[PDB]
Amino acid sequence: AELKITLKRSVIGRPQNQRATVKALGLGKVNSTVTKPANEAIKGMVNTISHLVDVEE
Amino acid sequence: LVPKRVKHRREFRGKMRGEAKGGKEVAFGEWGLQATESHWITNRQIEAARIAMTRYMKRGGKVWIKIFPHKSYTSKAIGVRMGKGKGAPEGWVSPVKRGKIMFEIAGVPEEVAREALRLASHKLPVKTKIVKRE
Amino acid sequence: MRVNITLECTSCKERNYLTNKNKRNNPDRLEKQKYCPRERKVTLHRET
Amino acid sequence: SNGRDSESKRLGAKSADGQTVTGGSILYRQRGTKIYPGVNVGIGGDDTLFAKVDGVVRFERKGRDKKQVSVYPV
RNA sequence: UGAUGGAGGUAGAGCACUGUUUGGACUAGGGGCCCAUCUCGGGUUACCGAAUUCAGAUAAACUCCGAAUGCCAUUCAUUUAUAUCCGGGAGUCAGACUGCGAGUGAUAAGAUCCGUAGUCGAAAGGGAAACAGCCCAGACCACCAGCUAAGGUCCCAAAAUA
RNA sequence: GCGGUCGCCUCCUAAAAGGUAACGGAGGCGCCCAAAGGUUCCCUCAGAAUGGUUGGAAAUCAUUCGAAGAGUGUAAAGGCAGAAGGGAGCUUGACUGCGAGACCUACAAGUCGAGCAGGGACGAAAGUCGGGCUUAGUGAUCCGGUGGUUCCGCAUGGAAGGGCCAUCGCUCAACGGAUAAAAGCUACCCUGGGGAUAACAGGCUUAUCUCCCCCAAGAGUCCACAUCGACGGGGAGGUUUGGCACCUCGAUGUCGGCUCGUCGCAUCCUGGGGCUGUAGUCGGUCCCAAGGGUUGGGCUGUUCGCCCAUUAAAGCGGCACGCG
RNA sequence: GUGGUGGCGAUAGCGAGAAGGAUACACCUGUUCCCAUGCCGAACACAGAAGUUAAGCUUCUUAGCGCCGAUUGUAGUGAAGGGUUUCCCUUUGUGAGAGUAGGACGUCGCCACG
Ligand SMILES: [K+]
Ligand SMILES: [K+]
Ligand SMILES: [K+]
Ligand SMILES: [K+]
Ligand SMILES: [K+]
Ligand SMILES: [Mg+2]
Ligand SMILES: [Mg+2]
Ligand SMILES: [Mg+2]
Ligand SMILES: [Mg+2]
Ligand SMILES: [Mg+2]
Ligand SMILES: [Mg+2]
Ligand SMILES: [Mg+2]
Ligand SMILES: [Mg+2]
Ligand SMILES: [Mg+2]
Ligand SMILES: [Mg+2]
Ligand SMILES: [Mg+2]
Ligand SMILES: [Mg+2]
Ligand SMILES: [Mg+2]
Ligand SMILES: [Mg+2]
Ligand SMILES: [Mg+2]
Ligand SMILES: [Mg+2]
Ligand SMILES: [Mg+2]
Ligand SMILES: [Mg+2]
Ligand SMILES: [Mg+2]
Ligand SMILES: [Mg+2]
Ligand SMILES: [Mg+2]
Ligand SMILES: [Mg+2]
Numbered sequence: 086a087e088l089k090i091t092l093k094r095s096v097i098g099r100p101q102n103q104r105a106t107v108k109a110l111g112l113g114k115v116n117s118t119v120t121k122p123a124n125e126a127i128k129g130m131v132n133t134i135s136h137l138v139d140v141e142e
Numbered sequence: 143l144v145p146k147r148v149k150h151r152r153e154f155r156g157k158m159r160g161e162a163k164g165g166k167e168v169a170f171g172e173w174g175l176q177a178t179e180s181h182w183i184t185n186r187q188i189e190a191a192r193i194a195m196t197r198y199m200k201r202g203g204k205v206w207i208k209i210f211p212h213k214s215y216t217s218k219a220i221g222v223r224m225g226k227g228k229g230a231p232e233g234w235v236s237p238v239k240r241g242k243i244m245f246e247i248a249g250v251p252e253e254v255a256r257e258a259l260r261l262a263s264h265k266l267p268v269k270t271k272i273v274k275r276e
Numbered sequence: 277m278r279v280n281i282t283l284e285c286t287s288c289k290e291r292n293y294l295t296n297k298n299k300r301n302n303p304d305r306l307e308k309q310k311y312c313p314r315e316r317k318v319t320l321h322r323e324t
Numbered sequence: 325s326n327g328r329d330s331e332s333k334r335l336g337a338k339s340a341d342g343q344t345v346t347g348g349s350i351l352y353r354q355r356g357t358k359i360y361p362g363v364n365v366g367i368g369g370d371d372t373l374f375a376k377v378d379g380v381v382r383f384e385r386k387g388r389d390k391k392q393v394s395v396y397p398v
Numbered sequence: 399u400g401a402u403g404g405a406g407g408u409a410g411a412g413c414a415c416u417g418u419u420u421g422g423a424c425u426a427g428g429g430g431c432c433c434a435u436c437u438c439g440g441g442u443u444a445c446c447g448a449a450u451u452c453a454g455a456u457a458a459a460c461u462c463c464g465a466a467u468g469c470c471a472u473u474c475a476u477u478u479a480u481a482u483c484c485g486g487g488a489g490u491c492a493g494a495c496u497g498c499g500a501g502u503g504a505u506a507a508g509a510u511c512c513g514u515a516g517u518c519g520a521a522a523g524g525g526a527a528a529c530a531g532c533c534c535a536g537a538c539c540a541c542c543a544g545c546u547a548a549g550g551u552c553c554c555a556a557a558a559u560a
Numbered sequence: 561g562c563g564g565u566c567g568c569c570u571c572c573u574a575a576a577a578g579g580u581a582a583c584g585g586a587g588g589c590g591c592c593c594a595a596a597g598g599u600u601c602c603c604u605c606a607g608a609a610u611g612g613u614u615g616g617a618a619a620u621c622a623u624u625c626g627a628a629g630a631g632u633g634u635a636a637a638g639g640c641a642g643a644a645g646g647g648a649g650c651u652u653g654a655c656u657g658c659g660a661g662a663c664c665u666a667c668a669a670g671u672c673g674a675g676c677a678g679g680g681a682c683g684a685a686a687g688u689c690g691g692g693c694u695u696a697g698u699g700a701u702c703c704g705g706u707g708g709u710u711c712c713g714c715a716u717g718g719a720a721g722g723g724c725c726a727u728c729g730c731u732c733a734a735c736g737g738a739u740a741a742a743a744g745c746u747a748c749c750c751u752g753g754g755g756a757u758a759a760c761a762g763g764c765u766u767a768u769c770u771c772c773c774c775c776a777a778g779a780g781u782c783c784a785c786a787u788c789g790a791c792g793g794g795g796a797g798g799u800u801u802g803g804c805a806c807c808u809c810g811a812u813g814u815c816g817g818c819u820c821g822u823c824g825c826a827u828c829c830u831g832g833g834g835c836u837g838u839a840g841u842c843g844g845u846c847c848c849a850a851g852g853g854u855u856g857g858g859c860u861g862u863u864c865g866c867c868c869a870u871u872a873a874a875g876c877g878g879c880a881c882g883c884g
Numbered sequence: 885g886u887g888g889u890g891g892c893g894a895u896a897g898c899g900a901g902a903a904g905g906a907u908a909c910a911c912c913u914g915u916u917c918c919c920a921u922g923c924c925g926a927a928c929a930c931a932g933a934a935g936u937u938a939a940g941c942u943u944c945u946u947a948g949c950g951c952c953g954a955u956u957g958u959a960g961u962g963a964a965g966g967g968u969u970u971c972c973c974u975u976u977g978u979g980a981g982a983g984u985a986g987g988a989c990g991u992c993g994c995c996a997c998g
Contacts, residue, residue, distance in 0.1 A: 093546095094534090095534075097517085098515090100516075109478045110477065121476090124477085125401075125475085126476040128399085130400085130476095132963090132976095133963080135976090136965085150459070151585090152586090153459095155505045156457095156505075158970085161959085163410095163455085169454060184792095189792090190793090193792095204421085213456095215504090217503095217767080218503080220767070220768055221802060222802090225583050227564090228584065229504095236456095260775085264775035266792085267794075278593095282727065289708085291707065291727070296593090296594095301594075309651090309652065311655050311656055311680075313655095314708090325565075326586060327565065327582090328566095329571090330570065333671090334579080336406070337406080337469095338663060339662090340469095340472090341404035341470085342402085342403055342471055344472090345662085346661055346662070347661065347674065348672090348673055349673095350663050350671090350673085354639090355694045356694055358638065366672095369672075371638090371693085372663085374672065376673090376675090377674080380472090383404055388893045388894085391405090
């Protein structure tokens with residue numbers, strides 16, 4: 086099923102790939118909720134920035 | 143100790159992270175001197191330790207030096223500004239990683255071996271210890 | 277000794293080709309069968 | 325002295341596997357045939373590989389331990 | 399970002415080539431000593447020892463091998479929205495530090511030179527006592543409202559003498 | 561500043577695409593070949609062992625072993641034994657006009673190129689051939705020279721003189737080349753700028769310097785450790801010689817001495833103590849101790865240093881080598 | 885069954901050993917001619933069919949050599965951190981080389997003849 090995503094750690098000092106994962110998911114300011122499907126692409130992005138993010142089923 | 147011929151006079155200092163490929167267990171002798179830290183070791187150190195071990199052994203037994211100074215190392219004369227090339231080779235050196243055995247000994251009782259290796263350890267810069275073969 | 281050389285069509289007296297040669301190894305005046313685009317045939321081109 | 329070197333020449337692959345490409349293109353510059361030519365591919369004076377017709381680039385092992393380039397059109 | 403397929407010989411590892419190298423068996427060959435001397439054939443210091451072989455090592459300019467990453471591409475997928483071309487206008491060509499990868503260096507320098515990422519520069523704010531460059535974090539404004547980050551909770555000085 | 565370098569090629573550095581710097585490490589080029597090219601056909605090397613005459617360690621012959629350990633014109637890298645290596649025939653494609661499209665690229669340039677047309681080489685034919693095994697063997701424009709041209713020709717015809725095409729002349733090597741043509745002194749110097757750039761002092765570092773310590777072979781009649789202490793190793797300090805050029809060039813005053821001192825202790829004397837190869841006096845060494853004291857002259861601008869003569873003693877350093 | 889001819893990373897190979905020639909392939913007998921050997925009819929080429937398959941060539945055995953090759957585990961390493969920061973450690977993920985277990989003395993086809 087879909088997953089909720091929230092930034093919990095800033096994009097400052099973090100590389101462009103992580104910053105672009107955030108822009109692509111569609112998140113801006115921290116503590117920003119977004120909802121996505123459980124695709125392998127988005128799970129890979131979440132594994133790319135797991136330290137930056139909290140998630141929910 | 144010196145290498146009699148070399149393909150390139152000057153070399154890189156290199157790096158020393160990680161344990162040693164080989165020389166990691168005692169092979170020819172009964173006891174040996176294991177390095178617990180990685181460091182450069184020179185001609186003078188090797189020869190001093192060898193002479194120490196031999197004298198305390200009273201030319202008994204046999205000693206084996208596993209390392210060899212393949213690498214060189216340069217320096218600039220005091221008063222020389224940086225640049226204008228690379229310095230002249232001062233001496234010769236062996237990069238000895240941790241886990242390496244440097245000296246092996248056999249043909250000599252155990253206490254004599256331990257004490258000779260103790261002496262050589264005090265002569266070397268590395269923090270060392272004793273190893274025995276099965 | 278080794279010299280850069282203009283060949284020449286013996287008929288048209290047109291140079292048409294640039295090449296190289298020794299004088300030691302190739303002292304005699306070099307010759308070839310080369311194309312003269314002014315005649316649109318093949319012709320004896322002789323060094324000059 | 326030692327302080328000199330030449331212009332680095334931009335060897336290696338230039339077209340990728342699974343990539344459609346024009347004819348006359350260039351696929352792999354090289355000095356010496358570190359990869360051989362194959363189907364619909366030529367080779368220049370400087371051992372450079374070029375596709376003679378359109379198609380997708382495909383690199384293949386030429387048996388055990390030599391490589392090949394091929395261009396299968398559509 | 400995922401999946402797929404490729405190029406590539408790096409860290410690592412290894413000795414299969416190129417070099418360096420330890421010990422041992424054997425030894426061409428090279429030393430003397432003596433007998434024999436036309437100086438001709440030996441016999442030994444467990445004399446020095448090519449070469450072969452056993453075992454052990456070693457490498458930026460060695461590789462039988464060989465990653466993680468990164469790179470190129472897919473009328474492939476997902477999510478976002480910036481890429482291209484034309485033309486106007488610029489400024490910038492003194493860069494600094496921190497972390498990782500290398501060189502020079504004395505594997506010293508807040509040293510020098512590159513790569514890579516970040517920050518400063520051009521960025522306030524909170525912590526590091528103070529402290530461009532470190533850690534957290536991006537000031538549109540107001541609020542005598544709240545939840546947290548790093549960092550902290552005996553007093554200075556808010557929070558546990560938990 | 562000298563040295564070295566400036567253009568081009570190869571490797572490493574270069575961090576498994578490409579690219580990537582240094583006064584970083586190593587080497588080369590400024591050509592050669594008329595066959596060292598093309599094609600057709602054929603062949604496969606190096607070394608070792610064995611044997612054999614001069615003939616040896618080793619020429620040449622023969623067999624076997626032999627996967628490349630050879631050779632590839634020339635550097636290194638890559639690659640090549642289906643050959644690019646080697647040999648023999650026939651030739652000259654080391655052709656002309658071109659060239660889709662790609663690579664690299666700031667620009668100028670550079671690289672590869674199927675394919676078309678003409679006219680050919682080789683080969684029975686397929687088919688290969690627009691130089692070599694791949695990458696260096698090179699340089700603008702201007703200016704002149706040579707040959708050709710169906711181009712132009714100051715009113716006309718010509719001519720002079722220009723253009724187009726082919727090509728020659730540049731270690732213009734400081735190799736994107738200032739001019740066709742060019743060395744020096746300045747302490748008589750002046751301007752404009754700079755801590756972007758030298759330096760004292762300062763700072764970072766501490767190779768070096770000083771001091772301290774570890775191992776302990778040995779010397780010490782014997783006895784390693786009273787006292788010394790080889791070869792070797794490890795640290796502290798920030799007084800030495802250095803390195804870096806961060807501050808200071810819209811001022812930075814340069815050494816020594818004088819006057820005044822102040823601080824540290826790695827203590828020169830005095831004070832305390834242990835060990836002694838300390839009989840006693842003198843001492844040697846080490847630990848504690850910085851309270852006070854720690855000279856006057858000759859020589860030199862001198863610090864230092866030597867000397868004279870005393871002293872209980874004639875300390876070592878820092879404070880912008882203290883203080884203009 | 886033999887011969888020819890192709891593809892698959894030699895898992896195909898190299899060595900050793902056994903047998904066979906029915907056709908076949910081969911050796912083999914020669915130089916008459918096309919043609920050839922920096923010398924040679926050895927090789928090339930041509931013609932033939934007395935003899936033997938001894939060899940080569942086929943089929944079988946062999947794990948000696950070489951080739952392939954796991955699993956586990958490790959090193960290394962991307963990302964995120966920590967430390968006492970020329971280095972070391974932790975979480976997660978990937979993951980060699982070596983050393984092996986083991987495989988492997990071939991697989992797939994086409995054609996001619998028997
Ligand atoms: K030590
Ligand atoms: K920024
Ligand atoms: K500055
Ligand atoms: K100044
Ligand atoms: K003053
Ligand atoms: Mg060429
Ligand atoms: Mg390595
Ligand atoms: Mg870090
Ligand atoms: Mg700096
Ligand atoms: Mg950096
Ligand atoms: Mg600015
Ligand atoms: Mg700030
Ligand atoms: Mg400011
Ligand atoms: Mg709260
Ligand atoms: Mg409080
Ligand atoms: Mg690269
Ligand atoms: Mg006229
Ligand atoms: Mg007129
Ligand atoms: Mg220039
Ligand atoms: Mg002035
Ligand atoms: Mg400055
Ligand atoms: Mg002022
Ligand atoms: Mg004291
Ligand atoms: Mg006086
Ligand atoms: Mg007087
Ligand atoms: Mg002063
Ligand atoms: Mg494996």
